[PDB]
Amino acid sequence: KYVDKIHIGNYEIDAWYFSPFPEDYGKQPKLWLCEYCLKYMKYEKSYRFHLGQCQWRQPPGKEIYRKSNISVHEVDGKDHKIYCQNLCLLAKLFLDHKTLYFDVEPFVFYILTEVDRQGAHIVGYFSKEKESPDGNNVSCIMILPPYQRRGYGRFLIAFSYELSKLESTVGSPEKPLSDLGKLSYRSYWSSVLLENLRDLSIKDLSQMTSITQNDIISTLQSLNMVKYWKGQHVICVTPKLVEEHLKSAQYKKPPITVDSVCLKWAPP
């Protein structure tokens, strides 16, 4: 029997996939997770006793973003190994294609939290390889189900690209993406590229956004905004065609924005 239900903070959440928690944890009707330190527990009693004891009220690592009650914590896999393993086991409950849970040393983890008077409540995260040969600026990205489709995933996507900008590189998410990750990236790429086209070559868009050119081109192909000429993709759009796509209904939700002013992060 596998873990199929968890209790984290004030949420109960059904699992989507097998996650390799130890055998005795899976057997339980559900797992109980501290929302701050990510310790997983077998019983409501041990969970309740932990809530009385745990002094964590936020992720470990360094708070590299804070604007109002939105916060990002950066957590090195080698410095905080238990915590990151727990994060990975939690994430594999909702990620089919994630394969790495216990070897967390090569990754850094970016934890999105919503803060209130009692603490910084975990919303989701993305991992990132410390040195990615393939140039991927996201390895796995995961919004917990109660927070999905509410702007947090978009926030985390924008954030991964703000880091890629500060590193003076382009990046792309590691593939395959979930069905919901595909739609989220496509929607984000559209948004960003359309806004820049309204406000330019494919290389310019790439440098301005840190989106790779492949991702730009394939997004413009699906928007039908690219011509082909003698082997080169070329941007073919009129200022009104862009505005037609933008003011359409599928971009009308007000984002949680990444404010670069509030991103205290230096590239190493």
Q: Which residues in this chain contact Na ion in the complex, by CB under 5 A?
A: 13-14
Distance of CA 113 to the CA centre of its chain: 12
- Between CA 208 and CA 94 the distance in angstroms is 32
Per partner kind, with CB cut-offs from 5 to 8 A, the member of ligand O9J, Zn ion, Na ion, none near residue 184 is: ligand O9J
Compare residues 148 and 218 and give the one whose CB is closer to ligand O9J.
Answer: 148
Q: Are strands 5-8 and 11-14 parallel, antiparallel or unpaired?
A: antiparallel
Q: Does 211 bind Zn ion (CB under 5 A)?
A: no
Interface residue with Zn ion, options 33, 37, 216, 226 (CB under 5 A): 37
DSSP annotation of 166: H
Q: Check if 174 is active-site.
A: yes
CB 122 within 8 A of CB 111: yes
Taking the complex as a whole, the smallest distance from the CB of residue 175 to ligand O9J amounts, in Å, to 12
- Between CA 94 and CA 178 the distance in angstroms is 10
Q: Does 97 bind ligand O9J (CB under 6 A)?
A: no
- Between CA 87 and CA 109 the distance in angstroms is 9
Interface residue with ligand O9J, options 51, 115, 180, 235 (CB under 6 A): 180
The one segment of 34-42, 45-53, 114-122, 149-157 that binds ligand O9J by CB under 6 A: 149-157
Q: Quick one: which of 56, 176, 82, 73 has its CA closest to 126? A: 73
- Between CA 76 and CA 121 the distance in angstroms is 19
Per partner kind, with CB cut-offs from 5 to 8 A, the member of Na ion, ligand O9J, Zn ion, none near residue 34 is: Zn ion
Q: Which residues are catalytically annotated?
A: 174
**Residue ranges that bind Zn ion, judged by CB under 5 A:** 34, 36-37, 39, 54
**Residue ranges that bind ligand O9J, judged by CB under 6 A:** 94-95, 141-143, 148-154, 157, 178, 180-181, 184, 187-188
